[PDB]
Amino acid sequence: KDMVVMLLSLLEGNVVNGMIARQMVDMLVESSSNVEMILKFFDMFLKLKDIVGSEAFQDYVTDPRGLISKKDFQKAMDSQKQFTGPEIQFLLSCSEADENEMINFEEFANRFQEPARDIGFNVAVLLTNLSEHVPHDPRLRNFLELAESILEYFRPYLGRIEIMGASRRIERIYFEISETNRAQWEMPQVKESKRQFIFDVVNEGGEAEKMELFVSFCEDTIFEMQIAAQISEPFWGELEVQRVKFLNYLSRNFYTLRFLALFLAFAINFILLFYKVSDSPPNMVYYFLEESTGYMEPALWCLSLLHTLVAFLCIIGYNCLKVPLVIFKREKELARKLEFDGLYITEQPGDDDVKGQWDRLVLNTPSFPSNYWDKFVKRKVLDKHGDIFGRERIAELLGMDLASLEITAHNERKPDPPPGLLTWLMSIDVKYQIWKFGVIFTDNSFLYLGWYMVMSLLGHYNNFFFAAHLLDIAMGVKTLRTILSSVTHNGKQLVMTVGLLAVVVYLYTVVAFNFFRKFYNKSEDEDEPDMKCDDMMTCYLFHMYVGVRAGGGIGDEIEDPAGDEYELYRVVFDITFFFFVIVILLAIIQGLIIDAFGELRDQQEQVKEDMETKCFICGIGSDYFDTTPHGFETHTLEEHNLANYMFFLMYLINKDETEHTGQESYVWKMYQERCWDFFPAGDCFRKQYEDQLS
Amino acid sequence: MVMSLLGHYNNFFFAAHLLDIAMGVKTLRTILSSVTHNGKQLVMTVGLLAVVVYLYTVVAFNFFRKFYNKSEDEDEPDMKCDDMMTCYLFHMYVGVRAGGGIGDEIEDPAGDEYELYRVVFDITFFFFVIVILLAIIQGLIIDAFG
Amino acid sequence: GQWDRLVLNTPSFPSNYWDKFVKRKVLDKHGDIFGRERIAELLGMDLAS
Amino acid sequence: ELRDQQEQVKEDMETKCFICGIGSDYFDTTPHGFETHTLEEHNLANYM
Numbered sequence A: 001k002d003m004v005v006m007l008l009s010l011l012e013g014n015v016v017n018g019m020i021a022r023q024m025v026d027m028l029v030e031s032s033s034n035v036e037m038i039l040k041f042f043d044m045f046l047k048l049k050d051i052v053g054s055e056a057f058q059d060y061v062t063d064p065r066g067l068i069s070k071k072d073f074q075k076a077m078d079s080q081k082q083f084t085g086p087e088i089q090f091l092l093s094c095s096e097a098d099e100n101e102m103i104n105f106e107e108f109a110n111r112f113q114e115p116a117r118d119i120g121f122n123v124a125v126l127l128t129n130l131s132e133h134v135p136h137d138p139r140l141r142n143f144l145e146l147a148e149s150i151l152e153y154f155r156p157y158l159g160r161i162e163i164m165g166a167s168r169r170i171e172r173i174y175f176e177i178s179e180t181n182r183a184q185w186e187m188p189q190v191k192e193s194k195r196q197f198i199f200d201v202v203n204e205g206g207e208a209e210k211m212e213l214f215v216s217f218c219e220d221t222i223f224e225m226q227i228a229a230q231i232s233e234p235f236w237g238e239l240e241v242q243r244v245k246f247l248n249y250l251s252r253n254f255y256t257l258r259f260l261a262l263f264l265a266f267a268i269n270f271i272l273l274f275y276k277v278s279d280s281p282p283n284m285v286y287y288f289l290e291e292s293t294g295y296m297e298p299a300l301w302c303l304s305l306l307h308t309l310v311a312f313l314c315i316i317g318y319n320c321l322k323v324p325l326v327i328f329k330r331e332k333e334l335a336r337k338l339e340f341d342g343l344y345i346t347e348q349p350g351d352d353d354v355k356g357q358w359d360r361l362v363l364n365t366p367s368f369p370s371n372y373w374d375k376f377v378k379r380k381v382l383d384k385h386g387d388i389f390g391r392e393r394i395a396e397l398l399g400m401d402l403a404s405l406e407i408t409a410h411n412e413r414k415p416d417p418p419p420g421l422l423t424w425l426m427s428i429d430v431k432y433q434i435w436k437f438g439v440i441f442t443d444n445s446f447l448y449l450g451w452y453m454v455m456s457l458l459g460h461y462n463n464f465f466f467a468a469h470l471l472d473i474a475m476g477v478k479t480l481r482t483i484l485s486s487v488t489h490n491g492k493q494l495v496m497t498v499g500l501l502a503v504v505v506y507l508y509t510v511v512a513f514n515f516f517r518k519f520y521n522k523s524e525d526e527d528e529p530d531m532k533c534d535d536m537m538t539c540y541l542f543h544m545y546v547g548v549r550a551g552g553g554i555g556d557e558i559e560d561p562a563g564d565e566y567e568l569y570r571v572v573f574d575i576t577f578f579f580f581v582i583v584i585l586l587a588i589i590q591g592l593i594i595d596a597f598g599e600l601r602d603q604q605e606q607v608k609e610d611m612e613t614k615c616f617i618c619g620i621g622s623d624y625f626d627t628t629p630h631g632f633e634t635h636t637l638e639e640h641n642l643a644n645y646m647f648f649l650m651y652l653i654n655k656d657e658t659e660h661t662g663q664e665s666y667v668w669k670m671y672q673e674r675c676w677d678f679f680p681a682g683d684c685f686r687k688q689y690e691d692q693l694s
Numbered sequence B: 001m002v003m004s005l006l007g008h009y010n011n012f013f014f015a016a017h018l019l020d021i022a023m024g025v026k027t028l029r030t031i032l033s034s035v036t037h038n039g040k041q042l043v044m045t046v047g048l049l050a051v052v053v054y055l056y057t058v059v060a061f062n063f064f065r066k067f068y069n070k071s072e073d074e075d076e077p078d079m080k081c082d083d084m085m086t087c088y089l090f091h092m093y094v095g096v097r098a099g100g101g102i103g104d105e106i107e108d109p110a111g112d113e114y115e116l117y118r119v120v121f122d123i124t125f126f127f128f129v130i131v132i133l134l135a136i137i138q139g140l141i142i143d144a145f146g
Numbered sequence C: 001g002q003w004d005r006l007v008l009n010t011p012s013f014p015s016n017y018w019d020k021f022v023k024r025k026v027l028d029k030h031g032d033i034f035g036r037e038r039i040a041e042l043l044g045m046d047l048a049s
Numbered sequence D: 001e002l003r004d005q006q007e008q009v010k011e012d013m014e015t016k017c018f019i020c021g022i023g024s025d026y027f028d029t030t031p032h033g034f035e036t037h038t039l040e041e042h043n044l045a046n047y048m
């Protein structure tokens, strides 16, 4: 592996048909027999690993202990028609058959899988690197064909990205994707987050912020993977292990509890349909269930208590699953503004940003970067702004002990962490907790869950309050949320047109009070008239209440204008109120909703169209890549796959800095400097070497 | 075929066959496709309509029951909101189909302590159910044509 | 998928499909890794025939 | 009709230069080429 790593280092910054790459191919050809032997070592045991697990092989295994004789092994392998004569004999020699010629094929298959994995992957990378940089060498395809199984095995783990290197050229980087990283990336919650992120940047995002948003998405996704790993499952100590297990259970099953609460709400409201009010006890009336089974009344009490418990568990499930991301994001953006902007050093927000003013409480807290990965943000800010703003003033702002900086760098102290609850009392950063709770209390999702719980408790005072919970279907079902989004999309316009409706009706009221009052007698009685327009407030209410809701406008409600001096004036008043209010203004309200359906629909189409016509990374259209058959499909899955950039960032974090290659160090340095110039923009490997590749 | 055989038991079953024009004529099938294109959304908004009407029923049963006497008779009242199931049916049956919402059907709220509360109940039910929710149903069909 | 298991061993499985030698091709492709006798049992094939 | 007019105006400004009329696709050969072109090379404010 170390020799191959040296060979891969010689290929750093190597152009297509480079002299070093062609020399390396000649070196492999000069030692072709040895290379074939090495490749024949890897595929034989990779094939052996899957053969022993095959159903046909198990038919030969007859020993109850799980062993197999050499003669039985001999007839098992040649029945697969995958190995030759000498190959089977070599496998027999490698098998540690006992004095009874019995072979433990379980350990035999797994004996070399782990020791030879690192070298096998690097050989696959070496052949892949040479093939893509010397594509017109007939001598190299022979090695690729002989290593087809090795390449196929490591295909899901061989990640490749393209970057703009320091040499002002597009370079292709090959790295390793671990099994855990790919498994976590394929989780449905992570995939849903990716779809939401893609929709946001394509719809309401810019080109200059596209890569910075993408990196921020990667940082959030990595943090969420840690949370999922922590909550996953395979006297103080006894309770703590059960407490975290209980909390993890709620975090894992947060959405099922949300569904369960919605189900219980319908069950409670179904029972409430049987309520009946009667003067007689089961001049005040009594409200009681009316059913013959006799089990619904106890069931309502049981469901009401159960619903309250589930709602309470949702809050605990939420603050252990979603709150850490909220704190992580807020700490992340605050730290960068402290360093790269000097938010509380230079600009000092002008009291109109409640978010900025609230974050002042956490600057001097000893545990400010609790969720954010960078634990040395204060150290970095001090080195950047200390000279221009004052080291002692920066330390006071960030709550840093300057005298403690050196002693920590000198040696390390190991104190006594007493596992007592009393010692745990004063170890709580009260100021940080106040800041953290303020962030949680300003979260829309947490406030909704809090309202759901409060309503559940009010349900115990009157059960009818459990009706409010049936609203949850607004966000419980995504189909309704999309439908309701068609109402809230133009919500501001809907409010204004209703306000405009109130003003136009007031103008009609003023005309009526002044000129048409006699026609507003709404009493069939003859000696006591119920005049509806003897007061402006009463007449305005009359127009807004019965006038708007009437099919034919105000004219339907008011007395006939026939045989009267003002008949023509009243026909204009009635027809104009019908047109302007009933016809035009109600069409605007309906028109806004209909237009919202079209506007939301094209946003989905626009996002889908952009993803299938342009690359998310380089921005080059699919038309250019389609010169080569299936060019755009291969480009978005192999060359500029956005998932590989996610994996490459995780690869750099786990890998030791001393082991970073020249290309890896270049990208890693720019990640720490927040410079996204390594992302290819408007260029790709295929475009840079069009003459050589074609 | 089954409906044709049932037609022999009662000839009126032969009416079902007139539905065939849905696929017999391609023009109608395209028109009907504009309804089934957003059929799932149409079902959900009707379900949403049932939930919003239930919330109005709960408010009525609790606070506005006196106004639900639908009997011109004076000694035997036909109270429509003395039971939740009856009151919910009343809102779903006459309330939704009324042009001006529930207010048109129920007794006038004038000269009463809860008059302002009842005007908000009547105007909001007109806006949310008659105006907004029926526009969504019509909006889904219109959007499907586009 | 579960309903199609009834037709795998039927003597006239490719009645309408033009390829009448699908069973022969499947046996040659998966017989070595899954067992020729087990494939024949699954597809209702007589190896001696 | 009014909605697409706003979209058309916004789309044209973000896809073509107001001065030379060359599309953003040509300038995007260079990373952030169109952004620099509309802020440094052919900025309409500089002509003012």
Ligand SMILES: CCCCCCCC/C=C/CCCCCCCC(=O)O[C@@H](COC(=O)CCCCCCCCCCCCCCCCC)COP(=O)([O-])OCC[N+](C)(C)C
Residues within 6 Å of the ligand: A451, A454, A455, A458, A461, A462, A464, A465, A467, A468, B055, B058, B059, B062
């Ligand atoms: C008010 C609803 C808030 C949310 C509105 C959305 C829901 C739409 C409609 C829902 C239906 C509501 C049920 C109404 C029927 C209840 C009748 C009743 O019990 O009326 C209650 C009135 O009491 C109350 O008002 C208590 C409620 C406190 C304040 C109510 C406001 C809710 C606060 C909301 C919390 C956060 C809200 C902020 C977010 C805004 C909304 C998102 C009287 O009893 P009762 O004595 O004779 O018996 C009790 C039996 N014993 C007395 C014998 C024990």
Ligand SMILES: CCCCCCCC/C=C/CCCCCCCC(=O)O[C@@H](COC(=O)CCCCCCCCCCCCCCCCC)COP(=O)([O-])OCC[N+](C)(C)C
Residues within 6 Å of the ligand: A504, A507, A508, A511, A513, A514, A515, A566, A569, A570, A572, A573, A576, A580
């Ligand atoms: C005379 C013809 C003018 C009517 C033109 C209508 C054009 C729009 C005008 C609207 C306001 C009309 C006020 C007229 C000013 C005074 C007229 C006069 O000389 O007044 C005339 C009476 O003529 C009339 O009856 C005019 C009747 C007007 C009815 C027109 C119906 C149109 C309603 C339009 C509602 C506006 C809402 C628009 C919303 C826009 C949404 C898109 C004689 O008085 P007077 O000695 O008995 O003592 C006034 C009475 N007070 C003692 C109370 C002061």
Ligand SMILES: CCCCCCCC/C=C/CCCCCCCC(=O)O[C@@H](COC(=O)CCCCCCCCCCCCCCCCC)COP(=O)([O-])OCC[N+](C)(C)C
Residues within 6 Å of the ligand: B002, B003, B006, B009, B010, B012, B013, B015, B016
């Ligand atoms: C039920 C319709 C099924 C399809 C609905 C879509 C059509 C929309 C409406 C169509 C109009 C239907 C005509 C109703 C009037 C019939 C009155 C009548 O005869 O009512 C019948 C009721 O009997 C029945 O119900 C028999 C029918 C069996 C079950 C009916 C359900 C139909 C089964 C559907 C088969 C597959 C359906 C699955 C797909 C779902 C739909 C796509 C009674 O007689 P009658 O005794 O006095 O005389 C007979 C004269 N002698 C008795 C003297 C002989």
Ligand SMILES: CCCCCCCC/C=C/CCCCCCCC(=O)O[C@@H](COC(=O)CCCCCCCCCCCCCCCCC)COP(=O)([O-])OCC[N+](C)(C)C
Residues within 6 Å of the ligand: A462, B052, B055, B056, B059, B061, B062, B063, B114, B117, B118, B120, B121, B124, B128
């Ligand atoms: C008091 C003002 C609160 C009204 C604010 C309305 C805002 C939304 C609230 C809706 C539910 C109202 C319940 C109020 C809680 C109890 C109030 C109270 O203290 O109750 C007050 C009475 O005040 C009232 O009359 C309030 C009347 C509310 C009418 C508001 C009409 C709006 C209808 C909205 C329908 C919701 C559907 C929304 C769908 C959304 C679709 C987009 C005194 O009791 P109580 O001693 O006689 O014994 C309670 C009676 N029981 C014995 C039966 C328990």
Ligand SMILES: Nc1ncnc2c1ncn2[C@@H]1O[C@H](COP(=O)(O)OP(=O)(O)OP(=O)(O)O)[C@@H](O)[C@H]1O
Residues within 6 Å of the ligand: A191, A195, A611, A612, A614, A615, A616, A617, A636, A637, A640, A641, A642, A643
């Ligand atoms: N750089 C890119 N990386 C990945 N996909 C890209 C890129 N540029 C454009 N795309 C397009 O994004 C589309 C979305 O990816 P795709 O649908 O294959 O993802 P998935 O992981 O299989 O799951 P899902 O269907 O949920 O998105 C692809 O069809 C591809 O054409």
Ligand SMILES: Nc1ncnc2c1ncn2[C@@H]1O[C@H](COP(=O)(O)OP(=O)(O)OP(=O)(O)O)[C@@H](O)[C@H]1O
Residues within 6 Å of the ligand: D013, D014, D016, D017, D018, D019, D038, D039, D042, D043, D044, D045
């Ligand atoms: N010649 C040009 N000069 C300026 N902007 C141009 C030119 N051609 C195209 N544009 C586009 O016009 C858009 C509008 O400019 P921009 O939004 O940056 O202006 P502003 O002064 O910051 O304020 P505002 O957001 O109110 O327009 C830019 O995003 C740019 O892409």
Ligand SMILES: Cn1c(=O)c2c(ncn2C)n(C)c1=O
Residues within 6 Å of the ligand: A219, A222, A373, A653, A671, A672
């Ligand atoms: C989690 N994480 C990052 O997400 C990260 C990083 N350096 C840069 N980034 C983006 N480090 C060191 C890190 O631990």
Ligand SMILES: [Ca+2]
Residues within 6 Å of the ligand: A658, A659, A660
């Ligand atoms: Ca090194």
Ligand SMILES: [Zn+2]
Residues within 6 Å of the ligand: A615, A616, A617, A618, A619, A620, A635, A640, A684
């Ligand atoms: Zn690309």
Ligand SMILES: [Zn+2]
Residues within 6 Å of the ligand: D017, D018, D019, D020, D021, D022, D037, D042
């Ligand atoms: Zn220009």
